[PDB]
């Protein structure tokens, strides 16, 4: 039915550790408006989970699709 | 091919404003391990974008699916 599309940019990735000492990568995605950026999604992924997704590098453009009962985050086409 | 599934819980929603004075809701999703929680996704959505998704309330269980070139975030079944 309805759908919203957000163009995101990966501005930051940082290695962090929980109390288990399990490693995650904190990935910050912002939207550009006007020229400023607002945060839109921050993900914390293990190194495995990132491999599964594919490349998600700083400077990459990310599509965030919001529809009824689903948010999808994909690389740009 | 490969796929990773994360069970998330919405622990927090907070009203915030960018410099445009545009309203977003900051939504924090954590994973339970052991008993502790680690952050997994933080989303900033306008009130419209949230309507499109459906209900996303504090205490709700969220599935995060990671596959090649896509992360999907859906309500629990």
Author numbering:
A (entry chain A), B (entry chain A): -1 to 32, 71 to 113
Task: Reproduce, without paraphrasing, sentences from the article in which this PDB structure was first reported.
The similarity of eukaryotic actin to crenactin, a filament-forming protein from the crenarchaeon Pyrobaculum calidifontis supports the theory of a common origin of Crenarchaea and Eukaryotes. Attempts to trace back the origins of today's eukaryotic F-actin filaments led to the discovery of crenactin found in certain organisms of the order Thermoproteales within the phylum Crenarchaeota (Crenarchaea, part of the 'TACK' superphylum). Hence, it has been proposed that crenactin filaments share a common ancestor with F-actin. In Pyrobaculum calidifontis, crenactin is encoded within the arcade cluster of genes, together with four arcadins, and has been proposed to be part of a cell-shape maintenance system.
In addition, we show that crenactin interacts with two of the arcadins, arcadin-1 and arcadin-2.
